[PDB]
Subunit: 437 residues, 4 copies
């Protein structure tokens, strides 16, 4: 085809294949419990990193070699990207993709012009969607790149920016609905502060809640049925981002009575940046009924910034997928690759190699996690571990019959409390048996 002529459609070839352009573990067609591997995993391509990132970092310029680099007019570039994107979706065999409104079309000098450019590109994507197998997983609004967002979007000290932010999200909800997106994401990149000295924290949090509330009202109004998702990150670019982690978000949603409308999009790199294991954040969201979708990537725990690397640690993908299987699998969410090739991986085909690495790592982890759940390896131990709550004083405690007085009566009468081993080391070695089975 046109943009990636050197790369043919990627196909499954098994763990012993030497072909770099093939899946080693991910077999889209493999059936597990009545669903193909493809529908269990719901892989999604991130439009921003894949088609707009150029290798630029804070200390250097673009390194990425891209076939659509030669166009000078912003609209020609936007159209070329849509073509390249759909060629890519077809070759990588991706069922989904995600985008920011500002990834797909350039801004104009006014909001009207910006919206006209957006309509042109949306119309084009819609034609491709009619003949592509790839669908939109979720859409979102970029409320952080443009200079107007210096002081925040809905948390801006400038009411005009709040007004603009509302207008942009209104448009973004409309195009997400039109393209058939199944979710809509909010990542508050500039929703936080840089210094407490000039910040009215209560006022900003009140406004943030007003904004989110206006967004759910508008979604109902136009009948958008996709799941609303908040994406936590502790910091960067801000010193403190309000949606610090899953718990912070829940504290916020419950206070402002927004908790019945939102779930969370958890990103591995953002979890570890807050000093939580990816699995902790997944588990905590699960038991709170808010594990909505996942941004599949990894950071480096020795680096204190968002690296957005393709995930290749299969021990981590296993522990992650264990949580997804425990909740019954994805509903509307999926595994969105919010990951970018390293600045040194600047050749076009590296886009393919990066995704193959991540898709294989997650496919393998899914298969192992699935055996861990099916064999009830950890669940049996957990049952035996907490068995004292099944009868006796424990049953009274869980049923609401016990209180401080009755428990004291009980406790004065017992002389020896005997505990048993937590078996962490044993549990970890069993995990290895399954990993390398």
């Amino acid at each position: 085809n046109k943009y990636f002529e050197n790369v043919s459609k990627i196909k499954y070839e098994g763990p012993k294949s030497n072909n770099p352009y093939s899946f080693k573990f991910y077999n889209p067609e493999e059936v597990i419990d009545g669903k193909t591997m493809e529908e269990h995993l719901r892989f999604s391509i991130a439009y921003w990193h894949t088609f707009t990132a150029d290798g630029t970092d804070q200390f250097g310029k673009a390194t990425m070699q891209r076939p659509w680099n030669h166009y000078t007019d912003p609209m020609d570039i936007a159209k070329a990207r849509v073509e390249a994107a759909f060629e890519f979706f077809d070759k990588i065999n991706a069922p989904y993709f995600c985008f920011h409104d500002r990834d797909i079309a350039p801004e104009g000098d006014t909001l009207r012009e910006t919206n006209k450019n957006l309509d042109t590109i949306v119309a084009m994507i819609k034609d491709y969607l009619k003949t592509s197998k790839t669908k939109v997983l979720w859409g979102t609004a970029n409320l952080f790149s443009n200079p107007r967002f210096v002081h925040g979007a809905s948390t801006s000290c400038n009411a005009d920016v709040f007004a603009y932010s509302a207008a942009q999200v209104k448009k973004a909800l409309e195009i997400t609905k039109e393209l058939g997106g199944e979710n809509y994401v909010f990542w508050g990149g500039r929703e936080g502060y840089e210094t407490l000295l000039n910040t009215d924290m209560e006022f900003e949090l009140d406004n943030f809640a007003r904004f989110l509330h206006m967004a759910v009202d508008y979604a109902k109004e136009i009948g958008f049925e996709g799941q609303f998702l908040i994406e936590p990150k502790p910091k960067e670019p801000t010193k403190h981002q309000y949606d610090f982690d899953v718990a912070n978000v829940l504290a916020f949603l419950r206070k402002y009575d927004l908790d019945k409308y939102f779930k969370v999009n958890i990103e591995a790199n953002h979890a570890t940046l807050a000093f939580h294991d990816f699995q902790h954040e997944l588990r905590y969201a699960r038991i709170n009924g808010v594990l909505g979708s996942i941004d599949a990537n990894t950071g480096d725990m020795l680096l204190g910034w968002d690296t957005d690397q393709f995930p290749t640690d299969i021990r981590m993908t296993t522990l992650a997928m264990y949580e997804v299987i425990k909740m019954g699998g994805f509903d509307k969410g999926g595994l969105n690759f919010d990951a970018k090739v390293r600045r040194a991986s600047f050749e076009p085909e590296d886009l393919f190699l990066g995704h193959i690495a991540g898709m294989d790592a997650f496919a393998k982890g899914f298969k192992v996690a699935y055996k861990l759940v099916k064999d009830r390896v950890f669940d049996k131990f957990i049952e035996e571990r907490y068995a004292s709550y099944k009868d006796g004083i424990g049953a009274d405690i869980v049923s609401g019959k016990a209180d401080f007085r009755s428990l004291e009566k009980y406790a004065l009468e017992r002389s020896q409390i005997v505990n048993k081993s937590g078996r962490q080391e044993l549990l970890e070695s069993i995990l290895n048996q399954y990993l390398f089975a």
Copy 2:
């Protein structure tokens, strides 16, 4: 007197005094707005670090030289500590002190024996309280040191430990009420997990909530009127402590409908361990109406464990006291020195030198913070900064009149959004003018 013969009562001598045993900045008697410095600050001595810590660390043995070290019988040691404690309170001139039930008396072979020992010591402390000016700020239960708490207290997988924990807290609430404590603290040292592989997170959080609920029921029953406080810490000894930070606690309290009974005790070292500035955690608690009390100390931001050092950074004490003054000052809470002398500061008089350092640093910070609030230095700028919400579209946004449609109408019609500087550098230099005034 008996235990600290070489040290006489510590008195204010001003910033030019060479006497190491005197306050340089803290004048208990100084009056500011109708209250003495002593009643503004409400300094409290931590019984555990001050009278029981012995310099032991994870790599070495005790270094602390203590006059009550010669006793062999546990009860003789407990009685000697009460004497020494009250001599110390008098000399350091402390209005308050805090304790754990297990700091003041030794455990016996059964809960009954433990409770009898506790009654003996409580009776003794009560006599001293009749003639001392020092009062009890808050009491608490040590639910983390004894081996029975390996798997947690209320989050233990062993129902017998839950029962014991209830019995201990029941007793602790009773003695706190009897000694006239103004608050009661919960620090969940073992309430978290070490590995997710063997943990039923939802079950443990449910039990934690049941426990806390039984505690408020019992407090009402015996008519204990002190404020209940949860003390956040992200980890250590656990890999993840459930009360991770203020937001985590609020998410929890709101979910289980416990939020109307609890406020938080924020410790500086515990805030920075979760990667929040002490001031952030204070501010967040304030705007949520849960800033209850403070554990005055500092950690080292380059060290990833709880150091509990005496606070000597006056820039930090200023920013901390700014928050306390903004909420109208302490109510029932105070500044409890949850700090210990370094292992190398093992001579008796170092106890005095440590406290003088911390009391002076907080007194100075209070005086500066007070001028910052009185002159409305940061508040004027904040007013001007967010002024666009006082009329026009901003007023419509705050009053509930605006929505996505009206805001879009507005936004399409505006062409230029003009922001103004946040002035962080200017704000920081003004802070220095006040600090060094």
Copy 3:
């Protein structure tokens, strides 16, 4: 036998065995390139964690259940541990063990008494050594636990402590030689500072070098031929430990002309605590000819203190063993398990389960690393990657022929510099193919 009656000798049973008391990956008998797996790996048991640690942490008391717990006399306990240790060595099938002088015998009231106790136990260990297959890998002196070391050992401000430290190390070198130890380790636990305000850094570093110099002089004198090793750690218990990381140690050794006598003992948890990957520290030591031995464990990268966990991450053990194989394998060093069971894993058999987990993880990693080296997977790419230095201007650069003038002449004449991809993502996915082969 006597101390671990419930546990029989641990034997290899393969990856499909359900028997928790067996090796799943480690087959001592398996031969690879003329050496058994046992002689490639040289596993060592840490005497301190295995026979003296009791579950105590900074917030709680001992949890460990140990058969020799009933003895009251310190010497009876020391003798019982030697018996238990050799029973354990036999059952876990360990070729080596390491110890601190203070692990094996209790101190007396004077150095003479301490040394007499040590002689008694050393004599006993020597008898067991005559009939055991287990040998001493390395010995070391505990210069950090006793209160006298508060201000450091050789870096103490107290000359008497320097004198004592010299005496202790002299004795420790003597008993290590007598027990046939192949190395001798220096871990400077208290060799650092807590505050710069009271520290003469140059003086302490000079004394540290004097001490180390006296130690090599004495080793020569008694003809001790084992390798001297320094063990880096960035901090804890100190705020800054002088032997911060491998590079810090090399800077020190080169300055004081000690570099020809020392190599390093690298511990995984200590490397990550300094914010280096374990592999980085291994590689850096290798290319500097100082990779001497390894303390096989893992920390938790989200926890800022030394956890000393048994290593179970096989991706990490692979990358570690890759470095050891690249240098030609161990010489006198080995894999010493400086790891302890979690406080919650307090039953005797957990000692076995912990070691099995770590031995299996390292055995598996060795086998994979070995295929990575044999197939030259990364080496081929590295050869192609740096090929421009094989001829042309690159050859002139490496041979010493080029200089700034000639290179400028060359550079002005070239118009396009073309780089090629670093292929990180591809390299990581190939690693996975090998891991899960």
Copy 4:
């Protein structure tokens, strides 16, 4: 004047001035020990942050409002910056400035064109230098921004990039000499690695040493007499930067026999990023005779990336200046403000406010540090603390008379070792007395 018409020359007005455009603590004219405050401090303006940074970050576009923003031709912009720079130097009253070759002129399509552009601008700066009081502190080469440096400069796997790097540094040394620079700096931004899988570490370190060696040879040849400086940073943009910290650099310089030519330029933010206090890194460099110059700024210890904030913590500036005074003051180095205004501080005058904040903080810290040194506050205590080395066994240890045998003889004969308090808390409170004197 032309570019900053709203700002007049900044003058000292004292701590009680309300004028934001004035020094509160920095009096250039104040004389201390025969030198003005201006010559003690040697303040330098960083050309890159001050005249080329535009508020761009990794998540957003430029926010900075700059009078020279309207030019379209790269050379017109470069000329306008020189004019603005000298207007700025005059108004802020800066004695020095630093620059990268690539800060002052734009690259062309070839190295020849690049060098011609550079000559044009250098000629212009030279005219301004004839009538300005500001001089060049140090120059440096930007070997990290251009795409060619993806894989490193001298550590590039591409020999052509090594050749180019040599050519650029040759030119940079020439223009630094011509502008009268007193030092020349090497910051290895791309000299490190992203993954060990594709890195030949020994080869890259060998080449790095060859490069540095060619640079000193060329400096001698053209008779450049300024001090060569290496600037440490642990990471960013790389995963590991070779010049990790001062100790790493010394290990490297000593191995390749380059240590007699280099000193270090220590940056506060880069020290804390490696988990060293700024003061530790300053002290360590001092006792090794390599404290060459300082980049005066601060990072945020809770943020894991380089923030380059203006320094406003006067407790830190005091501890920093204490080290500089202890070595006898600056020689050829100075205090270069490698700091930038926050993205939210985008108005022109914020450039002035940022520098005033930093200059005042350092001036105040200098004055306090100076009293700390003059009164020998910490030195007296250090003398008393280590006094045991002045005679007896301690004197034998320092003089080379003692050895393991004699020290053992001594140690067996002593029964009690008595240590004294380290007095950390006392020392910290005295620091506060001086700070707030």
